[model samples]
Target: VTRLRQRIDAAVAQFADSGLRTSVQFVGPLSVVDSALADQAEAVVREAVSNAVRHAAASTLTVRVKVDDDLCIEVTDNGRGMPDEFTGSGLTNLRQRAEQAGGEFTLASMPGASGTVLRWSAPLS
Candidate 1:
């Protein structure tokens, strides 16, 4: 738990140095099974959040994590959002990672919303 917080703190620092305003909310405890994938999960999250700050033009980013039946991570931001015709590398990479890990990734931009919402979920079993 301490190491995970440290990694997240480092990520936040990188974001700050990059001039990105971001907030993170991590909930729940680490289960034994999910502990094995901590690094991979963190990397996926780091990539997604960084892309949100950089390419999304987001002034604010939020990372939310929850553990229940599954482990869920969401990154939301206030930025330009994804256009109807948008198809890009960052999203593709995220989706691939999620799928490769036997999970799922979802990206959506709400109508009249200023930013995008990216979510990933994987089973804990």
Candidate 2:
């Protein structure tokens, strides 16, 4: 496994150990990636996972990363979703990171929904 993958796995494992049923999947050759993009992706995962662990009364969290022409990081949590008017700095940083990297970030969830979903992606080249 690549270092990034290993680190992410550990992060998920930590989540699982803390009453969260967590899983992570990495696709494509994520190792052979631009360092800047890798940093952005890693930051996205770390922040998203931590937010889920700390804020979500979630039972299950899933993280998925797929690398190609662009790198995609998606975090899904089955817990109380963020409030509609929520404006947290953790999320702000993530959005800014992806945007600065020429990508996009999106968070989707609402009352009655099972969980919250966050997706961040950036160009590899």
Candidate 3:
């Protein structure tokens, strides 16, 4: 838990230095998760938010975590989203991590909006 918090703090600092205003909200209860896998999940979320800020040139990044019987994390940004054929290395890596943890990762673009929403969900057990 300590290590994970440290990593998240470091990522948040880096994001702030990069001129991104981030907002994080936690919803539902805490889900049972493997510590190591949870760390990877945190990294995935951080990477996605960072990409949204840098590559998409987004000013605001929002992270929402819902911990029910399953864990759900959503990262959203108000910036130019990826193209239909935009299967980048970062996203590929994220998907790999999710699948390794028996989770699903999804990235979607908002219609008529210059933004993207990335979501990941996994069972608590």
Candidate 4:
């Protein structure tokens, strides 16, 4: 939890400095001791942030990491709008990671500039 939070804090801080208002949340005992899972989670966060900042045209962002029966990472932004379907290597990578982990990945938003949400989750057993 500590390491992850530290990483997230640094990312959020860096983005916030550049004028993207960001908020973060930790819920339900966050911890990922498994190195592979940890790395996947880290990448998810980084890519999600990168996508929002680069394409969302969003001024505010919300990130949430929750660990319980499942490890869940969510990123949301009020941006210009998402395509009818998400396309790109980042989304594909996220989907692949979750699939290999036997988890799920989802992206939700409208066709025009609007709020978008991305979620990646895996069962922790």
Candidate 5:
């Protein structure tokens, strides 16, 4: 998963350049079926992170990837949450990608908090 690591590192560095705090955690060993899936995973991360920083104005962001029977990726931020009229095409594409990959996707506002959380998962096998 060299490509995945590179993408994550690049994202973290980009956020750092914007004076935002970012962290990444891999809950266990991570692997994917192929580079194509890994590329899609990286895209998900990039899109989610960009939305958090650009749309939400998030100051702190966290990205977590866990691998078991499936590969799960979550991106969370502490910032202004989803707007009332938040109809972004990007999110739709993300959801479509997940479904097309035979996975699940979800995005939600954090309860009792001013931020957003995005999650996407696909089978590892």
Candidate 6:
């Protein structure tokens, strides 16, 4: 969790330097089940934030990591929402990683809103 926090801090600093409001929250205990899961979580955070900055046109971004029976990572942005025909390799690779880890991945535009939310979860046990 400390490592993941560092990654999130770096991302926040990077995006803040570009004048984007970025925040991260780690809810509950974020003890990692394995080092590989930690690495994947960090990668997901980086890719999600990069996509938000480059394509989402978002002014604010939020990331949340929580752990219980499973580890959950969610990235959300108040942006222009996803394009109608949006297809991005970053997200595709993220999905693949989650699947390979026997996890779940979901991406969706905020209902009746102008933003995007990405959620990924994997078993910790």
Query: Which candidate comes out best when scored by lDDT?
Result: 2
lDDT of 4 by residue, 50-75 (tens): 66544445367788888888899888
TM-score comparison, 3 vs 6, better candidate: 6
Report the Cα lDDT for residue 79, model 6: 60
What is the per-residue lDDT of model 3 for residues 1-125, given as tens digits with 9 covering 90 to 100? 43544454566566543666787777664435568666876787667755653544545667777777777888776656446423578788788888877889888787555377788878776
Per-prediction tally of clashes? 0, 0, 0, 3, 0, 0
- The 10-residue segment of model 1 with minimum total lDDT is 78-87
Ranking by TM-score: 6, 2, 5, 4, 1, 3
What's every prediction's RMSD, in angstroms? 3.3, 3.1, 3.3, 3.3, 3.0, 3.0
Tens digits of per-residue lDDT, candidate 2, 1-125, equal: 34777777876665344766787888999787766666667677777776665445546778999887788888877666345422488889898898798898888885654567788888877
lDDT of 5: 0.71
lDDT of 1 by residue, 51-111 (tens): 6434444466777777777778887766663463224776787777778778888877774
Clashes of 5: 0
User: Where is the poorest 10-residue window by lDDT in model 4?
Assistant: 78-87
- Between prediction 3 and prediction 5, the one with superior lDDT is 5
Please give, for residues 22-75, the per-residue lDDT of candidate 5 as tens digits: 888876665454677777887777766665544345466788888778888987
Which residue runs of candidate 6 sit more than 4 Å off their true CA positions?
15-17, 54-58, 81-86, 111-114
Weakest 10 consecutive residues, lDDT, candidate 6?
Answer: 78-87
Lowest summed-lDDT stretch of 10 residues in model 3? 1-10
lDDT of each: 0.67, 0.74, 0.67, 0.73, 0.71, 0.72
Which residue ranges in model 5 land beyond 4 Å of their true spot? 15-17, 54-58, 81-87
lDDT of 4 at 2: 43
Give one digit per residue, the lDDT tens place, for model 6 in 1-125. 35767776687666443656777898766555467887877777777766654444436678888888888988776667346422478779888889888999987785544377788888875
